[PDB]
């Protein structure tokens, strides 16, 4: 299967209340492996998964150095963007940043990305070819010109296409008994009568990894989001994910309804039907 290494950064200003909050998290697929939080005690990059805990003082010292450089860049960014948009000192504002690379089945490079938002919307993003920028407004154009003048795309691209992929492969290899496995969803259906003319069917998927899943209800093989109820995929808290989808049906007609499950850990899509 295909894989990803993604880093997520959040910086929040604190009017009248000093230094901004800064949180950094790294992921292989849907597995968190490092974090940094400016509110935490260590003031170092910390491990969050067993396989990364075997890297030496070199890895940790350097990752700490570089995560502090991100923090300082973001510290300057909040001042700059307050200037660009002439916002008062009174409000809290938020910067977010995501970058990463994807590889295919062979672990060869597939795509890379770098996105930056202010106050919850797109500010500037690297395009597909990793050679140029998309800027959302006149303030972000200022940034784009500065980042073209510094040939930022070029060195960012060197990281996304080389370094990112090279370290992803190593993390895959070191943590293989927990990154390289797909956990097939455990499925069951519940039936709960609501009256004498209606029942609820609920389709369950539990203990699956990765988080990407599709649960669809069909009636005689025809799509059915009339009177579906679908929750957002949610974390169990042990590394696996959960999700359900529910439909309310005429009594005596249970057997017209099928629940379809698509997941990477399944060799083929499941069908489930209520058998009494």
């Amino acid at each position: 299967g295909s894989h990803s290494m993604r880093y997520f950064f959040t910086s929040v200003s604190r009017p009248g209340r000093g230094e901004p909050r800064f949180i950094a998290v790294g992921y292989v697929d849907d597995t968190q492996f490092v974090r940094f939080d400016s509110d935490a005690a260590s003031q170092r990059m910390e491990p969050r998964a067993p396989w990364i805990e075997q890297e030496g003082p070199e890895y940790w010292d350097g990752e700490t150095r570089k995560v502090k450089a991100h923090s300082q860049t973001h510290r300057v960014d909040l001042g700059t963007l307050r200037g660009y948009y002439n916002q008062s000192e009174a409000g809290s504002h938020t910067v977010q940043r995501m970058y990463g690379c994807d590889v295919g089945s062979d672990w060869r490079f597939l795509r890379g990305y770098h996105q930056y938002a202010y106050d919850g919307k797109d500010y500037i993003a690297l395009k597909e070819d990793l050679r140029s920028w998309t800027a959302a407004d006149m303030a972000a154009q200022t940034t784009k010109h500065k980042w073209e003048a510094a040939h930022v795309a070029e060195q960012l691209r060197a990281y996304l296409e080389g370094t990112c992929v090279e370290w992803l492969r190593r993390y895959l290899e070191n943590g293989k008994e927990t990154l390289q496995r797909t956990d097939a969803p455990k499925t069951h259906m519940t039936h709960h009568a609501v009256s004498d003319h209606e029942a609820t069917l609920r389709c369950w998927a539990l203990s699956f990894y990765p988080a990407e899943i599709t649960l669809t209800w069909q009636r005689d093989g025809e799509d059915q989001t009339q009177d579906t109820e679908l929750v957002e995929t949610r974390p169990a808290g042990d590394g696996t994910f959960q999700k359900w989808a529910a439909v309310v049906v005429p009594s005596g007609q249970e057997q017209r309804y099928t629940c379809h499950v698509q997941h990477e850990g399944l060799p083929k899509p499941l069908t489930l039907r209520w058998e009494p």
Partner: peptide, 9 residues
Amino acid sequence: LLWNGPIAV
């Protein structure tokens, strides 16, 4: 492994 190259806006 982090990117070493982030630049101010």
